[PDB]
């Protein structure tokens, strides 16, 4: 019935139009009866009849006068629901203030008048006086005054003296003054001003008034003189025992204010003296303020035993406020909660339901069908018949169930799969039988978990359930990339049992026509489940366009593989099962099928795999016994040597040769080595236990030990668990985190010493406590993630944008962890794809890359292609489908309207359960050498030494693929060159970790001038160095007077002159920093590239504070300007540092601490956007200097590295999109729409500018700066005022929105929820689109 909402102040005539009468007396009920008075608070003439379709006197009885008024009682003959909404008004003798602007910290009246509220309150209660041009020459309109001053000015002027009091005076003053001259004078002042503290307030004032003038509201309306009154039902007064009432707080306040108004009216009825005029008006003021909001100013309860009364605000704010606890969090009927179990005989699209809850839930539907068949006559007859539960009820419920899906969820709805829908199938008992495979999706073990089942009502609900919430339609991971019907634990055991092969068993070596009779031999028990039988089988190939061509050939295989090929669908290659099928491989199987055959073949194939897995696993049978966990013999012997060597190490401490700490390191390392030895021994022992003869000679092969199958198959457990249970359990760490020196030499099969067990205890309690505490922080985290990305709704398909730069595979120092093809998988290109083959374009721009174009990249060795991205989308309050990428839940591209932001938030939040809260370089692969940022100088030896600390080295494969990446620490020598094809295992750089070198760039002598001996450089001839070394002490370290010239050693030629870098930059005199350890004595011939001095220098919280953008302990300062860097002056504390750009406004300095390391020198030709200091980097500068695209890469790389460290993968699109909402704000530099520096919505400013350039051709518009803001703060800065009012500071935000004439566009999600209107995101999106397209068109 609408699509947008605007909020503004009310108009008294409009208020009267809203009203339907005037209240005279507070008589809400009369004694000796129970019928309200006509002129009292409860008026039928104004609000309506309390008796349905009847006047009070009852003269017109609901048939002959329906809707018309009664001549006796002025009430229309209507129903009672109108009384729920019909409302009146109260006319005040004197206008009163709206105290919110009085009580708000940004006091709108005070801000508009630029005067605090202290005097305003005094004149409101008639303590101080308001002048209204009392004298044309002496004072102004906006001055305070006193009665004696009032008397003094009256005797002064009298004729022109005038000073009215109170709220009416305030209204007269504000009405008399305009806003235009105000806006011009304010804009003039802000244009030419220098003070900044008052500048912010002035900008707020001009913004408020310029919004006010556009809004069209009147400030005098702000001073209301008519107060609306709410309908009587909203103030409940139930008649209690003996003619009493609940005495709702609204009624008491209304009675108080009406009595005050009546007293004021009486006082003005006799021209009373001004002494009681002020008192009566003031008392009416406290009354009206208490009615509006009591306890804010005077706490005038006056109606209870020292307990507060809910005046008006209690029905708006507070948890008692119905908003976010009455439309967020609530009970519901038509549901059942119960314990669960496994019905391992059902389809994937089904779920069991026991009879009792089935009938109880569906009985309302039963009655509809019951009366439809007419077997029962009345509702009571049907109720009593179904009370006995005859034979008919079962068959009729079976009839109605078969098309009526139901919803199912678990209590911790972590992510999207927390809710599903199913086709019910009736079962006996009192337990919820569930399909096995989907059990993995819920992560719901059967340790006693409870799930709840809900039921839809309308046909729309059933249809959308069948469309979306069918688990058949939910197969892939919404999170990253994978089907969630990955086979479970027991099934993969049987499947692995299928694809084995012994060397000799019954029924082997013969040939079989096909899988049909192959099982016949096994069913007859005449052949092994696994052999080397040779079979000829027929397969199908999708090579033809839409046709599966058939071919066949004889192949050697195992018996079980034929059984699986019985059930495999048509178009699959045979080799996919010819290997040792594992847990990871079988999943990929489904994936491959999903990439070829579709959806129905995949689901039916998975169900059949589950059936066959259970059947054959049960048929095979494999327990685990004591004799299975065989102990390797040598293990004990091994620890003996370790023990011996440990004793030896103790002797080294006993003899005093070593200290405990290095002894500790020795013993822990040798214990770790022994653990590795015993682990490899036991895995070797278990790996090839089975040795079976075949035609005479014996021969080894892969073992059939039970634990070995649970290990290799990947069903459950890992090599760590097997090592623990079988071999050395290893030595763990003490609760402080330090590793105890005593290893626990035994395993679980053998007994443990009590001390060993006790040590092992607290290690497990650590993890248990971490898991127990984990359930709180993570979910709250998810909350902060959904609020920021609440709407993020795609609105149109393509905006035509072509922005974004160079999405490339990332190398993590060593080998690459993720390649290009999977990273770009599911993305849609923006720029055209150029193969590195001189204009041999592979993929056109603006095309979807699903697999085939990805398949076209590996052979072409393309290594850097950019695609579309949400950050590079220039829409308005929306995202383009062609700018987001392929949908994750479905193989096709994303459709229109879906809420990507919510999906991203839940996907990012779900893995929190898996995450805990708490000198040289060698090449490793064969490839070409590439150096980025080439800035190096050849040394005396002929090799290279780097002169730029930002230089980075990489290994590129000879085909152009990047394989390695390593940052080059400053002062690192080179042992190779660029482009040299070098195999792995070849060092190229050398340096010192704890000492950094500073190196000259030119050859020649070093005439040590421009330093002060003893003060700047000290001849600290230590015994170890044995030479007159040069140590440049710092200014604080050395004498203040001596260290006032920034000493610089003067490298000279044979002429002893200050040689320059030839003609280019600056002499060879390099300014020596503090603690410059120089061994040079005097006049030493030092060549170029020779060192001069040697300076002796929680994943979940990480995600949280990288999303909070919290400044780390070390904000690494960075050079935000170009030119040669310089050194600043010395100040009281942290020494200033100045920069010297080659042009522009070069004399720029900054405040720099000196205690922390400063890896900077005078001759560093820094550029626009390179680091000065080192350490952690705050997002603010990264955003503000090196663009949006750079900062996005850093944060996403950090978070994905954290998740990969946890071993959990999530696609970057979900983590990236919130980043775009991260940058939802921008500030202004060159104005023209805002004042000067309004930090506000970047999208709104951009859309205003884009039209403005085409409309107002010539105007500069606005030069902006897209700045960030904390996700919490960004949520506080939402443009949707209702969403802000949902959970914090309701009163303030509504007031500031109303004064600005805000018009909420209702484009969000929480706003649609709280009003209860249909969300225009899901199916409601089209419906709202259809409504606007058809209607209102």
């Amino acid at each position: 019935e609408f699509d947008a909402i605007k909020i503004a102040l009310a108009s008294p005539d409009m208020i009267r139009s809203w009203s339907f009468g005037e209240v005279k007396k507070p008589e809400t009920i009369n004694y000796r009866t129970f019928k309200p008075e006509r002129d009292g608070l409860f008026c039928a003439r104004i609000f309506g009849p309390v008796k349905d379709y009847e006047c009070l006197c009852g003269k017109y009885k609901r048939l002959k006068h329906r809707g018309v008024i009664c001549e006796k009682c002025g009430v229309e003959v209507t129903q009672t629901k109108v009384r729920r909404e019909r409302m009146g008004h109260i006319e005040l003798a004197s206008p009163t203030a709206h105290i919110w602007f009085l009580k708000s910290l940004p006091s709108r009246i005070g801000l508009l008048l630029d005067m605090p509220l202290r005097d305003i309150e005094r004149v409101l209660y008639f303590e101080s006086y308001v002048v209204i041009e009392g004298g044309m020459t002496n004072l102004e309109r906006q001055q305070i005054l006193t009665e004696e001053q009032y008397l003094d000015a009256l005797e002064e002027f009298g004729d022109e003296f005038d000073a009215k009091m109170g709220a009416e005076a305030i209204q007269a003053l504000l009405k008399s003054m305009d806003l235009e001259q105000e806006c011009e004078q304010l804009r003039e002042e802000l244009n030419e001003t220098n003070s900044e503290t008052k500048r912010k307030k002035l900008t707020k004032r001009i913004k408020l008034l310029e919004a006010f003038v556009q809004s069209g509201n009147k400030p005098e309306w702000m001073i209301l003189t008519v107060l609306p009154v709410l309908p009587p039902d909203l103030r409940p007064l139930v008649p209690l025992d003996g003619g009493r009432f609940a005495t709702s707080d609204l009624n008491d306040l209304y009675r108080r204010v009406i009595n005050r108004n009546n007293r004021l009216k009486r006082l003005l009825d006799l021209a009373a003296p001004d002494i009681i005029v002020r008192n009566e008006k003031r008392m009416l003021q406290e009354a009206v303020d208490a009615l509006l909001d009591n306890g804010r100013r005077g706490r005038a309860i006056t109606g209870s035993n020292k307990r507060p009364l809910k005046s008006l605000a209690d029905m708006i704010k507070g948890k008692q406020g119905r908003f976010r606890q009455n439309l967020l969090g609530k009970r519901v009927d038509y549901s059942g909660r119960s314990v669960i179990t496994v019905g391992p005989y059902l389809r994937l699209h089904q779920c069991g339901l026991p009879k009792k809850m089935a009938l109880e839930l569906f009985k309302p539907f039963i009655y509809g069908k019951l009366e439809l068949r007419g077997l029962a006559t009345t509702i009571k007859a049907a109720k009593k018949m179904v009370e006995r539960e005859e034979a008919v009820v079962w068959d009729i419920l079976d009839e109605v169930i078969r098309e009526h899906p139901v919803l199912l969820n678990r209590a911790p709805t972590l992510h999207r799969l927390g809710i599903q829908a199913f086709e019910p199938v009736l079962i006996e008992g009192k337990a919820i039988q569930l399909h096995p495979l989907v059990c993995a999706a819920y992560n719901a073990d059967f340790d006693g978990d409870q799930m709840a089942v809900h039921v839809p009502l309308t046909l729309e609900a059933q249809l959308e359930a069948r469309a979306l919430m069918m688990s058949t339609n939910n197969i892939l991971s919404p999170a990253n990339g994978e089907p969630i019907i990955v086979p479970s634990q027991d099934v993969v055991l049987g499947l692995y049992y299928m694809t084995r092969d012994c060397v000799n068993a019954k029924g082997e070596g013969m040939v079989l026509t096909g899988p049909k009779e192959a099982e016949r031999l096994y069913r007859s028990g005449l052949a092994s489940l696994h052999a080397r039988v040779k079979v000829r089988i027929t397969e199908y190939e999708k090579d033809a366009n839409g046709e599966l061509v058939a071919k066949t050939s004889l192949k050697d295989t195992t018996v079980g593989r034929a059984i699986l090929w019985m059930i495999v669908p048509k178009g699959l290659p045979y080799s996919i099962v010819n290997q040792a099928l594992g847990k990871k491989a079988i999943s990929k199987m489904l994936n491959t099928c999903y990439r070829i055959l579709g959806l129905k073949p995949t689901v039916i194939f998975a169900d059949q795999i589950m059936y066959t897995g259970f059947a054959y696993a049960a048929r095979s049978g494999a327990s685990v016994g004591i004799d299975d966990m065989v102990i390797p013999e040598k293990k004990h012997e091994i620890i003996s040597e370790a023990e011996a060597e440990v004793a030896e190490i103790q002797e080294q401490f006993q003899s005093g040769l070593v200290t405990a700490g290095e002894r500790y390191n020795k013993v822990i390392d040798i214990w770790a080595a022994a653990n590795d030895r015993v682990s490899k021994a036991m895995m070797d022992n278990l790996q090839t236990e089975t040795v079976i003869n075949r035609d005479g000679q014996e021969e080894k092969q892969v073992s059939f030990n039970s634990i070995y199958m649970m290990a290799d198959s990947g069903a459950r457990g890992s090599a760590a668990q097997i090592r623990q249970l079988a071999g050395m359990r290893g030595l763990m760490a003490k609760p402080d985190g330090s590793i105890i020196e005593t290893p626990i030499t035994a395993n679980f099969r053998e007994g443990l010493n009590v001390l060993q067990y006790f040590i092992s205890t607290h290690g497990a309690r650590k993890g248990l406590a971490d898991t127990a505490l984990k359930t709180a922080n993570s979910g709250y985290l998810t909350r902060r993630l959904v609020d920021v990305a609440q709407d993020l709704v795609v609105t149109e398909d393509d905006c035509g944008t072509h922005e974004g730069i160079m999405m490339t595979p990332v190398i993590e120092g060593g080998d690459v962890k993720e390649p290009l093809r999977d990273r770009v998988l599911g993305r849609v290109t923006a720029e055209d794809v150029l193969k590195p083959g001189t204009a041999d374009i592979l993929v056109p721009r603006n095309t979807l890359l699903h697999e085939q174009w990805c398949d076209l990249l590996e052979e072409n060795s393309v290594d850097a292609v950019k695609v579309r991205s949400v950050v590079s989308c220039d829409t308005d309050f929306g995202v383009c489908a062609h700018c987001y990428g392929r949908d994750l839940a479905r193989g096709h591209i994303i459709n229109k309207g879906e809420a990507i932001g919510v999906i991203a938030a839940q996907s990012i939040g779900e893995p929190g359960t898996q995450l805990t809260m708490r000198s040289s370089i060698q090449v490793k692969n064969k490839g070409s050498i590439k150096l980025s940022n080439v800035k190096s100088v050849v040394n005396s030896s002929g090799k290279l030494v780097i002169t730029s600390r930002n230089t980075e080295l990489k290994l590129i494969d000879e085909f152009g693929r990047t394989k390695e990446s390593y940052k080059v620490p400053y002062g690192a020598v080179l042992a190779k060159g660029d482009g040299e094809q070098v195999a792995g295992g070849e060092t190229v750089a050398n340096w010192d970790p704890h000492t950094m070198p500073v190196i000259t760039e030119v050859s020649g002598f070093v005439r040590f001038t421009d330093m002060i001996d003893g003060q700047t450089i000290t001849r600290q001839t230590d015994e170890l160095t044995g030479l007159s070394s040069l140590v440049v002490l710092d200014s604080a370290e050395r004498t203040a007077g001596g260290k006032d010239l920034r000493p610089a050693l003067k490298i000279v030629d044979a002429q002893g002159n200050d040689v320059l870098i030839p003609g280019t930059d600056m002499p060879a005199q390099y300014f020596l920093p503090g603690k410059a350890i120089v061994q040079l004595e005097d006049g030493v011939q030092i060549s170029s590239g020779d060192t001069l001095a040697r300076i002796p220098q929680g994943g979940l919280p990480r995600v949280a504070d990288l999303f909070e953008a919290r400044r780390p302990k070390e904000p690494a300062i960075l050079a935000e300007i170009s030119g040669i860097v310089s050194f600043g002056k010395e100040t009281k504390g942290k020494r200033r540092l100045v920069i010297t750009p080659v042009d522009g406004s070069d004399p720029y300095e900054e405040m720099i601490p000196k205690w922390r390391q400063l890896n900077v020198f005078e001759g560093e030709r820094v550029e626009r956007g390179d680091v000065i200091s080192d350490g952690p980097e705050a997002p603010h500068d990264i955003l503000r200097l090196r663009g949006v695209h750079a900062v996005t890469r850093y944060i996403v790389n950090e978070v994905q590295d954290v998740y990969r460290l946890q071993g959990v993968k999530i696609n970057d699109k979900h983590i990236e999109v919130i980043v775009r909402q991260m940058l939802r704000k921008a500030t202004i530099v060159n104005a023209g729409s805002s004042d000067f520096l309004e930090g506000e919505q970047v999208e709104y400013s951009r859309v205003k500018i884009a039209n403005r350039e085409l409309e107002a051709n010539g105007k500069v518009g606005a030069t902006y700066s897209r700045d960030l803001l904390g996700i919490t703060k960004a949520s506080l800065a939402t443009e949707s005022f209702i969403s802000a009012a949902s959970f914090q500071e309701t009163t303030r935000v509504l007031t500031e929105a109303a004064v600005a004439g805000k018009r909420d566009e209702l484009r969000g999600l929480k706003e649609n929820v709280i009003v209860g209107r249909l969300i225009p995101a899901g199916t409601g999106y089209a419906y709202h689109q259809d409504r606007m397209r058809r209607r209102a068109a």
């Binding site: 389809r347 699209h349 078969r402 098309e403 086709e423 046909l459 729309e460 249809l463 959308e464 069948r466 469309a467 979306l468 069918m470 058949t472 339609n473 579709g598 959806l599 129905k600 689901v603 479905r890 096709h892 459709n895 309207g897 899901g1322 199916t1323 999106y1325 089209a1326 419906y1327 259809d1330």
Partner: peptide
């Protein structure tokens, strides 16, 4: 009855318009 809408997705694929038109057709 029918449990998979893969056919709906592959030819008239959209998860909102199909639902709304089916609802307003079966309303009768």
């Amino acid at each position: 009855a029918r449990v998979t809408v893969q056919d709906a997705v592959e030819k008239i694929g959209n998860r909102f318009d199909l639902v709304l038109v089916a609802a307003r057709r079966a309303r009768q």
